[PDB]
């Protein structure tokens, strides 16, 4: 009858517009990978600047939801920015209302509930972006979560989003089968080499963005070109 808007349940379930939102997320064209170690959480993402006219400093899919929570966005960039602003507002409101930093799981629950409302109501469309949140929880350690346009927000040990989501998930699966107790350098290297292997690309320090939170320094830091180059050089040498 109507697979044109969400609120129809094509006659076996199959919310086709939500599936199309996932397809849009893939259509974004980029890939991002997230991993968590024993004390660190890392998010790498491909960085494409095909102009030389773009600032290349404003082309970033790494955002700081709060001082202690970071995120990498995939899919439509406008929807990504909108959801990032919503996440920042929700985190600030939680801090103002309850008096302590919002947990990453709760933040992803908020954004997932909002996306669920979009899928429940027919006026809206489920905005086609995938959010991957990173933070250090006071008791659960380096929480890494991923919210999707259907309202699913499962927490992950290592995940990926984008065109090569399946291959990145398989590579991280293989790596986490064995010795998942990863130090900071080990987990950064795991993420970077996962992205490089999946994309069949030798990464320059330019075309990747890395965001890190560590227990010792629980502040979402976007590694600079120099630090990314140091990690890449170490990877190449090993």
């Amino acid at each position: 009858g109507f697979d044109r808007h969400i609120t129809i349940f094509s006659p076996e379930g199959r919310l086709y517009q939500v599936e199309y939102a996932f397809k849009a997320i893939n259509q974004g064209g980029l890939t991002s990978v997230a991993v968590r170690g024993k004390d660190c959480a890392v998010i790498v993402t491909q960085k494409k600047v095909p102009d030389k006219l773009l600032d290349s400093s404003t082309v970033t899919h790494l955002f700081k939801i709060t001082e202690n929570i970071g995120c990498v966005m995939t899919g439509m960039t406008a929807d990504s920015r909108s959801q990032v602003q919503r996440a920042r507002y929700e985190a600030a409101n939680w801090k103002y209302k309850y008096g302590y930093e919002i947990p990453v799981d709760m933040l992803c629950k908020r954004i997932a509930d909002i996306s669920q409302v979009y899928t429940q109501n027919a006026e809206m469309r489920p905005l086609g972006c995938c959010m991957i949140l990173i933070g250090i929880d006071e008791e659960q350690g380096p929480q890494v979560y991923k919210c999707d346009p259907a309202g699913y927000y499962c927490g992950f040990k290592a995940t990926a989003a984008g065109v090569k989501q399946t291959e990145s998930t398989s590579f991280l699966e293989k790596k986490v089968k064995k010795k998942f107790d990863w130090t900071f350098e080990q987990t950064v290297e795991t993420a970077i080499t996962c992205l490089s292997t999946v994309l069949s690309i030798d990464f320059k320090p330019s075309e990747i963005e890395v965001g890190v939170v560590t227990v010792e320094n629980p502040k979402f830091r976007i590694l600079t070109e120099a630090e990314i180059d140091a990690h890449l050089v170490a990877l190449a040498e090993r």
Binding site: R4, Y20, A21, K23, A24, Q27, E123, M124, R125, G128
Partner: peptide, 16 residues
């Protein structure tokens, strides 16, 4: 997925 509204996703996940 038609192209008559911004609330509709194309089968390709592309708002037309």
């Amino acid at each position: 997925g038609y192209d008559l509204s911004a609330s509709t996703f194309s089968p390709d996940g592309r708002v037309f």
